[PDB]
Paper text:
Here, we report six structures with near-atomic resolution captured by cryo-EM, representing human [name] ([name]) in closed, pre-open, open, and pore dilation but non-conducting states. We expressed full-length [name] fused with a green fluorescent protein (GFP) in HEK293T cells and characterized its electrophysiological properties and show that it is a voltage-activated delayed rectifier potassium channel with a half-activation membrane potential of −10.0 ± 3.5 mV. The channel has a three-layer architecture: the upper extracellular turret, transmembrane domains, and intracellular domains occupying 3D space with a size of 130 Å × 130 Å × 130 Å. The tetrameric [name] apparatus adopts noncanonical non-domain-swapped VSDs, with distinct pore domain configurations.
Six distinct configurations captured for [name] are primarily based on the pore dilation and ion distribution. The overall Cα atoms and the side chain of the two closed states are almost identical, while the differences are density peaks of the water molecule and potassium ion in S0, indicating that the water and potassium in S0 layer are dynamic in the closed states. For [name], in a closed state, the four pore-lining S6 helices form a bundle-crossing in the middle of the membrane right below the ion selectivity filter with two layers of hydroxyphenyl or phenyl residue, Y460s and F464s, forming the hydrophobic constriction sites through intrachain and interchain π–π interaction to prevent hydrated/dehydrated potassium ion flow. Below the hydrophobic constriction sites are hydrophilic constriction sites through intrachain and interchain electrostatic interaction of Q472s and T468s. The hydrophilic constriction sites together with the hydrophobic ones form a long channel gate. In the closed states and pre-open state 1, a strong and unambiguous density peak is located between the hydrophobic and hydrophilic constriction sites. The density is more likely to be a dehydrated potassium ion, and we name it site 6 or S6 as the seventh potassium ion selectivity site. If our closed states represent the deep closed state, we suspect that the voltage may act on both S4–S5 linkers and constricted sites for the [name] channel to sense the electromechanical force. However, there may exist a deep closed state (for example under −70 mV membrane potential condition), and our closed structures may still present a pre-open closed state.
Author numbering:
A (entry chain A), B (entry chain B): 11 to 301, 320 to 403, 408 to 692
The structure:
Amino acid sequence: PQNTFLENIVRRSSESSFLLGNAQIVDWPVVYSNDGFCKLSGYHRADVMQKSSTCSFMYGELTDKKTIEKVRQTFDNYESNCFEVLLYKKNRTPVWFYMQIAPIRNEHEKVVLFLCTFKDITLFKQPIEDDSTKGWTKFARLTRALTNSRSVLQQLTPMNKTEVVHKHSRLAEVLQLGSDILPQYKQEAPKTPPHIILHYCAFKTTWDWVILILTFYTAIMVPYNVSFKTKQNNIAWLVLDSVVDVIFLVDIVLNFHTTFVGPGGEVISDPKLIRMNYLKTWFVIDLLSCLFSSLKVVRLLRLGRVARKLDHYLEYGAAVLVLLVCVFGLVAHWLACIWYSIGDYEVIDEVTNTIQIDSWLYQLALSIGTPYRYNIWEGGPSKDSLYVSSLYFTMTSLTTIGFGNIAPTTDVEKMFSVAMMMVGSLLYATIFGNVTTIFQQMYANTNRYHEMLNNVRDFLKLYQVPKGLSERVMDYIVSTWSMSKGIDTEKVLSICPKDMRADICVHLNRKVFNEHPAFRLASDGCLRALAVEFQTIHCAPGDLIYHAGESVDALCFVVSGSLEVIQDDEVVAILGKGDVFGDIFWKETTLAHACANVRALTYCDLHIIKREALLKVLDFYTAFANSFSRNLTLTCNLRKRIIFRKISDVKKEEEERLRQ
Amino acid sequence: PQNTFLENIVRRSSESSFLLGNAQIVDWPVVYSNDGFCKLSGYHRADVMQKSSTCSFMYGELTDKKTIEKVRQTFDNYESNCFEVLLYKKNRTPVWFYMQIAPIRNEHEKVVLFLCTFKDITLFKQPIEDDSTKGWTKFARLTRALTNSRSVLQQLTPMNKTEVVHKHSRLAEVLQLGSDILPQYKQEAPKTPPHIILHYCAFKTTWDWVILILTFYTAIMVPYNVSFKTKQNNIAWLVLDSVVDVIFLVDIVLNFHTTFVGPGGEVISDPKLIRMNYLKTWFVIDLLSCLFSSLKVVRLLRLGRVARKLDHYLEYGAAVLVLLVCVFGLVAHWLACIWYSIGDYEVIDEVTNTIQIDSWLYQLALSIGTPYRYNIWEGGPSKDSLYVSSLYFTMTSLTTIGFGNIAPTTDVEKMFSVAMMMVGSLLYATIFGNVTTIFQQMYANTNRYHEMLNNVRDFLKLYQVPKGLSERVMDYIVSTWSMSKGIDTEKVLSICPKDMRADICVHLNRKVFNEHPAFRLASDGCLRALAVEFQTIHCAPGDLIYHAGESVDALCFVVSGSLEVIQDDEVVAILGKGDVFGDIFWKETTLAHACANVRALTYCDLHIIKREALLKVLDFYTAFANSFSRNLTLTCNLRKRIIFRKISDVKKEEEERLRQ
Ligand SMILES: [K+]
Ligand SMILES: [K+]
Ligand SMILES: [K+]
């Protein structure tokens, strides 16, 4: 969601000198100056900014009087025109310019900035100058002033009386740029050229899933047709092949119109580069795959598409497991096809006209019930039994079960089963490794929690901490890991540098900013500083925040629960739900003694800000410091003692007073 | 690629007093003084340096006048000679020296330094001295002055009239050291003695690979010939054994000429140590291996070479997997040989003349179709079937499949298969462990990324951060891990102490040094300091760098993208591609309030330098501070406010002015 507006202007201007200036401000100050205007005028792009976009500060002695007023109305009412003005450069050189004013538009059709395109026509006109000594001085400067607009732009007729042709060319340039000078200043979305498909669109993902399904179907079906002959053709299996072939041809055609992700950058939408990118990467595999035994078996090259498209899924853990189960099934099927091919070859030695007792097909025929007949040779098991038997055998050898119904007993079968076992061992090992890694991924976090728990327990047991204090520590550990689930705030906030840290911290401390009268005249910067400086704590019933002699160095705001400030074993304050206690740091400059114990009745919630951070923030911002001083009344100041005398003391002392 | 020049000089001088001095500088200052010249003259090697290499500061009263001039021309035109001079030591002792000047040469044949070898001939001449009281004082000092040159060098004829012999010896010494005094001062490469082969050469790696292939071939072939008899000799299997044996003899001969890597140091090229290093390490295994059943079976000791040479490959993960697959195959082959040996022994009990029904050879003969005949005993399976069957069986027991075609049923076979299973369990477990470690190696990094992603997601969900801000955080996380791929700059730059940190940081910030006019009069040290002090940030569209009240404490250089400085909801500046904004830290000494909001239009790229580091660098370097102050013009100073009044305000106020 970029806002590429300067990029479009510099891509369309083709070495121009646009002078973008603000519109809603009086005098229309200049906002941006291209580094082509720094040469046409001699002003560096630090002295031209914040000046009028009329170029009023280059208007001089003999500047055309009417043009100044006319461009003034042109800026008054928002409209676009073109002018020929006679300005002065930084060297007081009378030089002509072509003004191509064109207002810009906002998102919801509002004028925001004024664009001013400039061109130099010094050699194209007659710049009458007073401080001259010879006629030639009136000509050489013409070659000096125009260098990139005469030898580059108009060099075909550099002859006199063609100045009217130059004026006509300027008029044609200004008239035929109605939409080229208004790229609609706006925060837009990425745009693609016509007839280009985004690689992450909703259609492309569905197309990729369909291609994956079809590739798996072809991988399943091609070896079956190659090995289990099945040369009989039907209606429900001869049109599907053609449909899949034309679908893959459509995919090849449509893959020329995809947005290839750049090496570390973003998407590229240039048809002039994607075409040979695809050509050099994967135009060989697809062509051969989508074109006799070789022609029907080459279709297995379609797995390259599956390999390419499965990159983001391969990152996860369970996706690799599903992929490996799928390839396990596919490898079992392929080995079943090869096993049946061997078994069919070996039966019935063709040199003689006998049947080999060794081959697993003969043993399977014996164990099934249907034997071979005739001596041409006909009989044996049906076509479903052969495939299910081959798959069963090659699945008993990949899972390392090996029952022994169907087993190698011929010279070829044994030396093929050796390769079967060699491959299956590695495949099965990879499956085991993936499963154990998947389990370790979660048991890592669980064991990370349990290790800390065990370390705390062993530390408490080793130093014989008395019961009643170890219980509190263990309860705190359990409760904090229950509430937070091991999610530390500091590690998460370390990431996301200080643009989102401030926003997150302002959101977290919303319960001390929105509902408290001190933080209502604070600018956003001060609120961000305070939010990033607070930090928060969680209390538990019976826990003391301040003792009877601790140094108060924090302002604490209670957002949930109830506190109890007790002094001399007497309750002197009860706090809760919007009460602030602590000390007046900003006008005492001395750490105090906490005069009373602040216990927690219920499960409390406090946002405490340290003394130093608060003092720094209040020192940096002045007006908010006064507002905070005036608008903060502490409900329990833990610096001054409350002077009182209990009733029981009076009642006791009265007895002795009467006695004496 | 060392520059060992002092080492060669001290190894060749044999306790001399060379006085290396620079040549291209006037007066030829002394550069280095050996700690043998600190005794011949009494000058410590801190007062003799930066003095003339002519020893002009030891030239005294009665020094030989002609020799001073002659050595002066000898230094004038670059040439080597020898002189006999009469200098004074630190104690003003008239002492004779032998000068052996010899210029040194650069890489491309240039004179750089002048070498001056010295010797003492005090006792070898007549040092007439004035402050003497008795004749014996003219003799004892002769023994005092010469101690390491008379009792060590010339002690065979310590008799008078032999001083001419000493002069002849000095002449022979100086004449026959033409190349020994010029070791060609140059940054050379490691040099090996003639007829010594570098262990990491391109020939040695090919030789090692060939030896590995031959060792695997021998390991495959020797047990087959020992067990599967095959005593018939052919032409294609009797010369190969001799060729391999002579190749291994050549390897044994050639292993005496290898550069053994020292214990923690570098290669050693001393033939006097490598020979007994190899002799003590591995001269016993090779000799016996390269020398009846014992003689043909001892050739399996060649696996020691494989074990030795496979040390760097064993570090990786996949190499161990390939090695374990190879040893799995080799162990299966060896167990096949042992299994066939047992099966061949057990058939046909030789005490009687019957055939044992139990032995697996008989069952295999029944299941194949070819039975035993005769009762000497002839028939059975062919020689290919026996080996393929043995390998199949011992592969069904190592992969834990166990079909059951071929299975132990005799007393010996069962108690051998027990050991088979015991070994195979451990081998198969090791293969599984290696596979799971290999997978964990990469899933560690992937899970490390996913754990942080999940923690961020759970933190956002737990604290109910509103939508529209959690989306930005998640997008930032995804985008930064996409661009950087988890490669943190700080951890990489922590390594490589501050010689390559400076160079790397200068290279990274090349887009603010080369194309910016402030950094053009800065020495390399200042550029290194600034580069190591910058740090860089990446922005995103809509992200704010400075708010309306933040403290500007950084100079920011934009190298890619576009920024937008807006004040009072009005665009006042547009930045991009070489624009610097911030504050003038070096002449204000006060943190300011950012007067405007700096938003990012497109994906920006900023190099920001903090206030304190910049101030330290500009304080340490003085002239560059002035150059930086003069040559830096901020395009948007975020300290001063721009005073303006919008057009809508004027238009609105005019209506009320007319109304009243
Ligand atoms: K099994
Ligand atoms: K069985
Ligand atoms: K079995």
